[PDB]
């Protein structure tokens, strides 16, 4: 019985880690896109300077 409850907890815990990894990789893509805007914004300030 302990092995059954332990195996189920491992699958549930493993699934939660996979969902968190997807959100981490998703936020990283958004950060990279927003980071690229810094170059465009800085380029305008640089070209205006």
């Amino acid at each position: 019985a302990k092995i059954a409850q332990l195996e189920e907890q491992l699958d549930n815990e493993t699934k939660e880690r996979q969902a968190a990894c997807k959100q981490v990789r998703r936020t990283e893509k958004k950060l990279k896109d927003v980071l690229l805007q810094v170059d465009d914004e800085r380029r305008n300030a640089e070209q205006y300077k």
Binding site: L35, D39, R42, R43, E46, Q47
Partner: protein
């Protein structure tokens, strides 16, 4: 990213000096045409050299994967024969005893 940002910043310095000298580029059309063509040729050489180096570098990368996969495939079969030899050795000692 910081290196690419510095490259764009350094390029702006060249454009700033060019804009400030654009008033004299028109008057110097007798030699600006020949000098302008030389600048474009240098850019083509950098693009061609960079493209050639990138294309040539890709060939070495393919060799590191295609040749490595062939050696790994052959090495995998060699390791399988070694493990089979160990099992066959035990059968000889057991068969000889019987």
């Amino acid at each position: 990213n910081k290196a690419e940002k510095q490259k764009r910043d350094l390029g702006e310095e060249l454009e700033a000096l060019k804009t400030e000298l654009e008033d004299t580029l028109d008057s110097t059309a007798a030699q600006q045409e020949l000098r302008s063509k030389r600048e474009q040729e240098v850019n083509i050489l950098k693009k061609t050299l960079e493209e050639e180096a990138k294309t040539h570098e890709a060939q070495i990368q393919e060799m590191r994967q295609k040749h490595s996969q062939a050696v790994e495939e052959l090495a995998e079969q060699l390791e399988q024969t070694k493990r089979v030899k160990a099992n066959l050795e035990k059968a000889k000692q057991t068969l000889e005893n019987e």
